[PDB]
Design a protein around this nucleic acid. Structure first.
Ligand SMILES: Nc1ncnc2c1ncn2[C@@H]1O[C@H](COP(=O)(O)OP(=O)(O)O)[C@@H](O)[C@H]1O
Ligand SMILES: [Mg+2]
Ligand SMILES: [Zn+2]
Length: 660
RNA sequence: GGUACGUACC
RNA sequence: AGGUACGUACC
């Protein structure tokens, strides 16, 4: 096309075109990135005409956004005129970042790529003075100890150094924040809402926060807000699955004599039962910790029964005991593991297994939210010829299980729905992740039409370019005000709707209302900081900027501060001398006859390392320099000090540095 | 692995 | 403040 702005876009851009630092607040679908390109071209064109050094960096918080901002926005309008490049940690150039800065005029990258070069840690580096404009996308993250705020804390530091050089001149970049909502910072009052707006203004060094006002009617025509529903389920159904699981948990509690001060299937129970597992492992109480381990899995089944279907609660238990069968049973290619407690808990499950399995095949006692979800999907997918939608849910397991729920039900396939899950790429969950490539292909199929309905976690709410939806359902999920408006922003087709499906017992309905309340406070707070006089604004911004510098000085001073027993059976296994590190992350035992203390089972290599005497997971085997080496996960051991017994979730939590 | 942010519950 | 869990992300 040709690079022009709409009247509402020009109204918010104007201060940035005159060199002033600003935050631009534009809704989803408004074209915030197109404003960034117009400002980028305008900024550079002026620097050429004035015979000056022009250089722009566009910082993003996700890797796909580097590629996305190149194709859709920056390359089409700047590639023929200026040197443009996209860069991230995933892309492996054979060029140092300092050289990339020297050769290119527009740099789009993830923020940590800039921070890594500013910090150095390991070798003529980059400074913020090298850039004349810094654009921060999703600038509401310019907060607390996030990369955006560390970059901007360096900016504010050099700003104070520049005042000293006047008295005895290092140049400062222009700064442009881009967001839909700066948010409210979890405030429950208007004062704390306004404070949070001023903090974000202070962190980005904004002369003014900027919203569409004059051309507000035009903006309302461009983006249409969806219709709001709240579909509540009172849960007056009988729940024999809950009742029978509770009887099993009560049976297990009597055996070990561990009694809670909390309801079954609740979050305090989960905290209690995990705490009780940790204590029992430290105190060499195998009976107590094994029962607590099983009790947690039954507590998972209850809360699974609350959110998804009872077959998934059953399969959660059934797979756990299938995994126990594999580890505890003696196989070939080996060198009794079953206690009284192990046999007690196993027999208990097999006794109730018949009833639970067949009770789960009766859909009349299945979750009420599932039928509220069904009825919402059915009426909305028949409404339009070529529909599309997203179901937001909390857990990864619920995303997969809802996908199976839709697949094991041909009436959804009959009505035109073709579902697929969409989850995160991290490896800190008990459910397996989708890779960054698998995420990219599902969203490409979603826009193509091959996939019709995403069942997503918070992966789907911010940043990524997802096709306009006719429906977005928040299935029990209520997070913050920013995520709310972002979810509601995905619903921007003709006749689009936004629906909270939830139970009245969960309290998610009430938390949605507080986020609605907070969203209203945010617009009132933005209005007040804009109407604030310059003398009042500048004083308050300097206070926050000054105390933000002190905040990191405190956290800097905060951060400036044996044998291994098996957690289940307490057998002596390693000394502290035996452990060594590979790639400065994976810890490995190097005892000469370590092989005799563990067995191998399949589920850098998919082979578990389990205790010989009790079948407790210790970690996995790995190949490194052509040597089969045992990797020990710290979670599975009671570390014994000789001066006290403790358990750690990470190797970094130990006060011990290990060799190469 | 390391770190950050969000939510709920202590 | 810190802790537990879920979730997401970046290097
Ligand atoms: N001034 C403009 N003229 C023509 N097209 C525009 C203009 N501004 C934005 N667009 C188009 O609208 C789309 C903006 O959508 P999106 O990127 O979802 O906005 P946001 O990132 O603000 O949610 C882009 O694909 C762009 O081509
Ligand atoms: Mg955009
Ligand atoms: Zn053991």
């Amino acid at each position: 096309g040709d690079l022009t702005l709409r009247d509402y876009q020009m109204e918010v851009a104007k201060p940035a075109l005159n060199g002033e630092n600003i935050i631009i607040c534009l809704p989803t679908g408004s074209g915030k990135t197109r404003v960034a390109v117009y400002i980028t071209k305008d900024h550079l064109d002026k620097k050429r005409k004035a015979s000056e050094q022009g250089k722009v960096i566009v910082l993003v918080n996700k890797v796909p956004l580097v590629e996305q901002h190149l194709r859709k926005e920056f390359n089409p309008f700047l590639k023929h005129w200026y040197q443009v490049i996209g860069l991230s940690g995933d892309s492996e150039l054979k060029i140092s970042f300092p050289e990339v800065v020297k050769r290119y005029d527009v740099i789009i990258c993830t923020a940590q790529i800039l921070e890594n070069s500013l910090l150095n840690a390991t070798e003529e580096s980059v400074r913020l003075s090298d850039f004349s404009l810094i654009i921060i996308d999703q600038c509401h993250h310019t907060q607390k100890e996030g990369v955006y705020n560390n970059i901007m804390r360096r900016y504010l530091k050099e700003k104070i150094k520049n005042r000293k050089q006047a008295k005895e001149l290092i140049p400062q970049p222009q700064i442009l924040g881009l967001t839909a909502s700066p948010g409210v910072g979890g405030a429950r009052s208007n004062s704390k809402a306004e404070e949070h707006i001023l903090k974000i203004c202070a962190n980005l060094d904004a002369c003014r926060i900027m919203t569409v006002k004059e051309h507000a009617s035009q903006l309302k025509n461009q983006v249409k807000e969806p219709f709001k529903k709240t579909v509540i389920a009172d849960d007056k159904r009988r729940d024999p699955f809950r009742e029978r699981i509770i009887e099993i948990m009560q049976d297990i509690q009597k055996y070990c004599q561990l009694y809670p001060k909390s309801e079954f299937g609740s979050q305090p129970y989960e905290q209690w039962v995990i705490r009780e597992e940790r204590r029992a492992a430290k105190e060499e109480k195998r009976k107590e910790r094994v029962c607590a381990e099983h009790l947690k899995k039954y507590n998972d089944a209850l809360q699974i029964n609350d959110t998804i279907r009872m077959v998934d609660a059953y399969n959660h238990l059934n797979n756990f005991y299938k995994e126990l069968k594999r580890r505890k049973t003696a196989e070939s290619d080996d060198d009794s593991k079953q206690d009284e407690t192990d046999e007690f808990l196993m027999r208990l499950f097999h006794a109730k297994k018949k009833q639970l399995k067949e009770l789960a095949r009766k859909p009349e006692y299945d979750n009420e939210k599932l039928m509220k979800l069904r009825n919402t999907l059915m009426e909305e997918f028949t409404k339009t010829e070529e529909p599309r939608g997203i179901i937001f849910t909390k857990t990864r397991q619920s995303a997969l299980a809802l996908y199976h729920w839709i697949m094991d039900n041909p009436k959804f396939e009959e009505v035109g729905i073709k579902a697929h899950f969409l989850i995160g790429a991290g490896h800190n969950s008990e459910t397996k992740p989708m890779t960054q490539n698998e995420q990219r292909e599902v969203i490409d199929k979603f826009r193509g039409g091959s996939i019709n309905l995403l069942i997503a976690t918070t992966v789907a709410e911010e940043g990524l370019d997802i096709k306009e939806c006719n429906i977005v359902i928040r299935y029990g999920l209520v997070t913050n005000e920013i995520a709310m408006v972002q979810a509601r922003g995905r619903a921007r087709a003709d006749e689009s709707t936004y629906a909270l499906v939830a139970s009245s017992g969960s309290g998610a309905v009430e938390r949605e209302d507080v986020n609605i309340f907070r969203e209203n406070m945010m617009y009132k707070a933005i209005r007040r900081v804009q109407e604030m006089p310059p003398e009042e604004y500048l004083n308050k911004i300097q206070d926050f900027q000054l105390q933000s510098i002190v905040e990191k000085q405190m956290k800097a001073k905060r951060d400036q501060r044996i044998t291994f027993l098996c957690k289940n059976c307490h057998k002596l296994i390693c000394s502290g001398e035996d452990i060594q590190v590979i790639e400065n992350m994976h810890h490995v035992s190097v005892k000469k006859d370590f092989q005799h203390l563990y067995h191998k089972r399949e589920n850098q290599t998919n082979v578990e390392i389990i205790c010989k005497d009790c079948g407790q997971v210790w970690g996995n085997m790995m190949v490194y320099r052509g040597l089969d080496l045992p990797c020990l996960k710290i979670r599975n051991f009671v570390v014994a000090f000789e001066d006290t017994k403790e358990i750690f979730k990470k190797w970094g939590e130990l006060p011990i540095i290990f060799p190469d």
